Design a protein around this motif. Structure first.
Motif, PDB file in Angstrom:
ATOM      1  N   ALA A 114       0.839  -1.197   0.000  1.00  0.00           N
ATOM      2  CA  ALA A 114       0.000   0.000   0.000  1.00  0.00           C
ATOM      3  C   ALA A 114       0.881   1.257   0.000  1.00  0.00           C
ATOM      4  O   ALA A 114       0.605   2.218  -0.719  1.00  0.00           O
ATOM      5  CB  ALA A 114      -0.942  -0.018   1.177  1.00  0.00           C
ATOM      6  N   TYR A 115       1.946   1.239   0.808  1.00  0.00           N
ATOM      7  CA  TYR A 115       2.836   2.387   0.932  1.00  0.00           C
ATOM      8  C   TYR A 115       3.563   2.626  -0.398  1.00  0.00           C
ATOM      9  O   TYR A 115       3.642   3.757  -0.874  1.00  0.00           O
ATOM     10  CB  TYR A 115       3.834   2.191   2.075  1.00  0.00           C
ATOM     11  CG  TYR A 115       4.904   3.250   2.151  1.00  0.00           C
ATOM     12  CD1 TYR A 115       4.649   4.481   2.732  1.00  0.00           C
ATOM     13  CD2 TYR A 115       6.169   3.026   1.635  1.00  0.00           C
ATOM     14  CE1 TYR A 115       5.626   5.459   2.803  1.00  0.00           C
ATOM     15  CE2 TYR A 115       7.156   3.993   1.694  1.00  0.00           C
ATOM     16  CZ  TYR A 115       6.885   5.214   2.285  1.00  0.00           C
ATOM     17  OH  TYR A 115       7.856   6.173   2.350  1.00  0.00           O
ATOM     18  N   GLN A 116       4.100   1.550  -0.982  1.00  0.00           N
ATOM     19  CA  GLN A 116       4.925   1.647  -2.189  1.00  0.00           C
ATOM     20  C   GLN A 116       4.042   1.980  -3.398  1.00  0.00           C
ATOM     21  O   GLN A 116       4.415   2.809  -4.227  1.00  0.00           O
ATOM     22  CB  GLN A 116       5.703   0.352  -2.427  1.00  0.00           C
ATOM     23  CG  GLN A 116       6.829   0.125  -1.427  1.00  0.00           C
ATOM     24  CD  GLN A 116       7.887   1.201  -1.489  1.00  0.00           C
ATOM     25  OE1 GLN A 116       7.942   1.994  -2.428  1.00  0.00           O
ATOM     26  NE2 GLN A 116       8.743   1.232  -0.482  1.00  0.00           N
ATOM     27  N   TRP A 150       3.931  12.345   1.126  1.00  0.00           N
ATOM     28  CA  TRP A 150       3.519  10.967   1.375  1.00  0.00           C
ATOM     29  C   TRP A 150       4.673  10.180   2.012  1.00  0.00           C
ATOM     30  O   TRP A 150       4.514   9.543   3.065  1.00  0.00           O
ATOM     31  CB  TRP A 150       3.029  10.291   0.091  1.00  0.00           C
ATOM     32  CG  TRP A 150       2.740   8.835   0.286  1.00  0.00           C
ATOM     33  CD1 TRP A 150       3.547   7.785  -0.044  1.00  0.00           C
ATOM     34  CD2 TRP A 150       1.569   8.263   0.893  1.00  0.00           C
ATOM     35  NE1 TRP A 150       2.953   6.602   0.298  1.00  0.00           N
ATOM     36  CE2 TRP A 150       1.740   6.861   0.879  1.00  0.00           C
ATOM     37  CE3 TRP A 150       0.392   8.791   1.437  1.00  0.00           C
ATOM     38  CZ2 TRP A 150       0.783   5.988   1.391  1.00  0.00           C
ATOM     39  CZ3 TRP A 150      -0.554   7.926   1.946  1.00  0.00           C
ATOM     40  CH2 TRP A 150      -0.361   6.543   1.916  1.00  0.00           C
ATOM     41  N   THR A 151       5.839  10.209   1.365  1.00  0.00           N
ATOM     42  CA  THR A 151       6.943   9.366   1.803  1.00  0.00           C
ATOM     43  C   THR A 151       7.504   9.885   3.131  1.00  0.00           C
ATOM     44  O   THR A 151       8.001   9.102   3.921  1.00  0.00           O
ATOM     45  CB  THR A 151       8.033   9.250   0.734  1.00  0.00           C
ATOM     46  OG1 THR A 151       8.362  10.565   0.288  1.00  0.00           O
ATOM     47  CG2 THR A 151       7.599   8.388  -0.432  1.00  0.00           C
ATOM     48  N   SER A 152       7.414  11.199   3.372  1.00  0.00           N
ATOM     49  CA  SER A 152       7.976  11.811   4.575  1.00  0.00           C
ATOM     50  C   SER A 152       7.063  11.560   5.784  1.00  0.00           C
ATOM     51  O   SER A 152       7.501  11.654   6.926  1.00  0.00           O
ATOM     52  CB  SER A 152       8.223  13.286   4.376  1.00  0.00           C
ATOM     53  OG  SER A 152       9.194  13.512   3.363  1.00  0.00           O
ATOM     54  N   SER A 153       5.786  11.251   5.530  1.00  0.00           N
ATOM     55  CA  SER A 153       4.780  11.251   6.602  1.00  0.00           C
ATOM     56  C   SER A 153       4.650   9.871   7.259  1.00  0.00           C
ATOM     57  O   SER A 153       4.161   9.775   8.376  1.00  0.00           O
ATOM     58  CB  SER A 153       3.444  11.732   6.109  1.00  0.00           C
ATOM     59  OG  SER A 153       3.500  13.114   5.792  1.00  0.00           O
ATOM     60  N   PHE A 154       5.064   8.814   6.557  1.00  0.00           N
ATOM     61  CA  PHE A 154       4.900   7.444   7.048  1.00  0.00           C
ATOM     62  C   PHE A 154       6.252   6.722   7.030  1.00  0.00           C
ATOM     63  O   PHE A 154       7.011   6.836   6.070  1.00  0.00           O
ATOM     64  CB  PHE A 154       3.850   6.706   6.217  1.00  0.00           C
ATOM     65  CG  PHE A 154       2.526   7.423   6.161  1.00  0.00           C
ATOM     66  CD1 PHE A 154       1.665   7.409   7.247  1.00  0.00           C
ATOM     67  CD2 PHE A 154       2.161   8.148   5.038  1.00  0.00           C
ATOM     68  CE1 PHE A 154       0.459   8.088   7.206  1.00  0.00           C
ATOM     69  CE2 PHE A 154       0.951   8.823   4.997  1.00  0.00           C
ATOM     70  CZ  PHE A 154       0.103   8.791   6.079  1.00  0.00           C
ATOM     71  N   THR A 155       6.532   5.978   8.103  1.00  0.00           N
ATOM     72  CA  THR A 155       7.838   5.368   8.302  1.00  0.00           C
ATOM     73  C   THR A 155       7.667   3.924   8.790  1.00  0.00           C
ATOM     74  O   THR A 155       6.695   3.585   9.469  1.00  0.00           O
ATOM     75  CB  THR A 155       8.693   6.212   9.256  1.00  0.00           C
ATOM     76  OG1 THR A 155      10.066   5.969   8.943  1.00  0.00           O
ATOM     77  CG2 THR A 155       8.423   5.905  10.712  1.00  0.00           C
ATOM     78  N   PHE A 156       8.626   3.077   8.414  1.00  0.00           N
ATOM     79  CA  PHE A 156       8.543   1.642   8.615  1.00  0.00           C
ATOM     80  C   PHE A 156       8.814   1.306  10.085  1.00  0.00           C
ATOM     81  O   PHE A 156       9.787   1.770  10.667  1.00  0.00           O
ATOM     82  CB  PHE A 156       9.544   0.921   7.710  1.00  0.00           C
ATOM     83  CG  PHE A 156       9.336  -0.568   7.626  1.00  0.00           C
ATOM     84  CD1 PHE A 156       8.202  -1.092   7.025  1.00  0.00           C
ATOM     85  CD2 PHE A 156      10.268  -1.445   8.155  1.00  0.00           C
ATOM     86  CE1 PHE A 156       8.012  -2.461   6.948  1.00  0.00           C
ATOM     87  CE2 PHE A 156      10.072  -2.814   8.080  1.00  0.00           C
ATOM     88  CZ  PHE A 156       8.946  -3.319   7.476  1.00  0.00           C
TER      89      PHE A 156
HETATM   90 NA    NA Z   1       8.706   7.048   4.565  1.00  0.00          NA
END
Ligand code: NA
Ligand SMILES: *C/C=C(C)/C=C/C=C(C)/C=C/C1=C(C)CCCC1(C)C
Ligand SMILES: CCCCCCCCCCCCCCCCCCCC
Ligand SMILES: CCCCCCCCCCCCCCCCCCCC
Ligand SMILES: CCCCCCCCCCCCCCCCCCCC
Ligand SMILES: CCCCCCCCCCCCCCCCCCCC
Ligand SMILES: CCCCCCCCCCCCCCCCCCCC
Ligand SMILES: CCCCCCCCCCCCCCCCCCCC
Ligand SMILES: CCCCCCCCCCCCCCCCCCCC
Ligand SMILES: CCCCCCCCCCCCCCCCCCCC
Ligand SMILES: CCCCCCCCCCCCCCCCCCCC
Ligand SMILES: CCCCCCCCCCCCCCCCCCCC
Ligand SMILES: CCCCCCCCCCCCCCCCCCCC
Length: 269
Positions: free
Chosen positions: A20-22, A78-84
């Motif tokens: 979903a993230y990718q 998007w990429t900055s807001s969610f982290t693994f």
């Molecule tokens: Na990220």
């Protein structure tokens, strides 16, 4: 649960699968990439149309600049807001980040909607309608549609009733725009070649579908009801996919068709 959009809500509670993230990252990247390509297209082909039509090409190019910059910003957001998280193996809302923000897209709409509606008036000729009247109606209803939509989305998570009521108000302005555009298409078809009329028919269908995708994507998380299948990361993926399809269609493909119409119109002698 401190977050206040659907994306942040899902991100903070359930998190996003790798897929979903990718997927979302890639579709948003494709979005801005297409706008950059479009920008070069509209610049490079500007001489293919007669001077009298070139304001349409200009407005397409300016739309491409705005969409490129703001969709690029949205993609990075998007990429900055969610982290693994390794323990859980999903992407969660990052307290260290700036949080996902719908502002970039809504600002894009505020800027692009008036230009997209305006630009057709430099290619078609009206008959019994006044240029200024159509322009003003487009611009007023366009602004009000986006503003009321933007108010609505604040309540996406916190107040479904307000979300839907503001959405309905926004939809009223949208219906007005559809009504005016249909009139513009009909008048534009008067006194042009059948080849031109065919392109305008296609423009109308593209416009109707692509613009309706936006309220579709607005409602997306709730189209299977609360705790429905779409009330989930799958709803987030679907929303951003549909927005991206809508952006490419309403901005790039629309602009390409108008350019093709302008070329066609010049062929009558
Ligand atoms: Na990220
Ligand atoms: C390039 C961007 C465009 C053409 C944006 C168009 C946006 C809309 C047609 C939005 C419409 C909305 C409604 C009709 C109701 C729900 C709220 C909105 C703002 C998504
Ligand atoms: C990640 C990088 C993707 C950028 C591709 C942009 C291609 C634009 C074509 C003009
Ligand atoms: C018919 C028009 C020729 C093909 C249009 C190509 C548009 C490319 C825009 C960049 C995505
Ligand atoms: C990337 C977009 C490339 C657009 C090329 C269009 C060439 C037209 C020349 C007149
Ligand atoms: C509230 C519901 C709105 C429904 C559509 C309103 C359309 C009003 C048209 C205003 C035209 C102003 C011309 C500058
Ligand atoms: C909010 C935007 C409203 C726009 C209304 C028309 C602006 C241009 C006025 C020209 C007078 C004919
Ligand atoms: C609790 C119900 C809240 C409904 C808000 C509706 C706002 C409509 C504004 C016009
Ligand atoms: C909720 C949606 C309400 C729709 C009402 C339509 C507003 C007026 C648009 C029709 C234009 C007639 C000239
Ligand atoms: C996503 C928008 C797809 C609509 C394209 C249809 C235009 C040609 C219709 C025949
Ligand atoms: C998921 C988005 C669903 C919107 C369907 C778009 C088709 C609209 C055609 C006119 C009504
Ligand atoms: C599945 C049904 C989805 C259709 C919803 C599209 C949005 C309709 C809003 C019209 C203003
Ligand atoms: C990946 C997205 C590709 C974007 C498509 C833009 C090209 C539009 C072609 C329209 C040509 C119409 C010819 C009449």
């Amino acid at each position: 649960q401190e977050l206040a959009n659907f994306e942040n809500f899902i991100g903070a509670t359930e998190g996003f699968s790798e897929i979903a993230y990718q997927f979302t990252s890639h579709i948003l990247t494709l979005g801005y990439a297409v706008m950059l390509a479009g920008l070069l297209y509209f610049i490079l082909t500007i001489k293919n149309v007669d001077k009298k039509f070139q304001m349409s090409n200009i407005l397409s190019a300016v739309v491409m600049v705005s969409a490129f910059l703001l969709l690029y910003a949205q993609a990075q957001n998007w990429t900055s807001s969610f982290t693994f998280n390794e323990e859980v193996g999903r992407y969660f809302l990052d307290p260290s980040g700036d949080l996902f923000n719908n502002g970039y897209r809504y600002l894009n709409w505020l800027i692009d909607v008036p230009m997209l509606l305006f630009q057709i008036l430099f290619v078609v000729s009206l008959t019994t309608s006044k240029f200024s009247s159509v322009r003003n109606q487009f611009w007023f209803s366009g602004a009000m549609m986006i503003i009321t939509g933007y108010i609505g989305q604040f309540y996406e998570v916190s107040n479904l009733t307000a979300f839907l009521v503001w959405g309905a108000i926004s939809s009223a302005f949208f219906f007005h725009i559809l009504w005016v555009m249909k009139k513009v298409i009909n008048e534009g078809k008067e006194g042009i070649s059948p080849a031109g009329q065919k392109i305008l028919s296609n423009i109308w269908i593209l416009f109707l579908i692509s613009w309706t995708l936006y309220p579709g994507a607005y409602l997306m998380p709730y189209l299977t009801g609360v705790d429905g299948f779409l009330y989930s990361e799958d709803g987030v993926m679907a929303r951003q996919l549909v927005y991206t399809i809508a952006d490419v269609s309403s901005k790039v493909i629309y602009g390409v068709l108008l350019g093709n119409l302008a070329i066609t119109l010049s062929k009558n002698k």
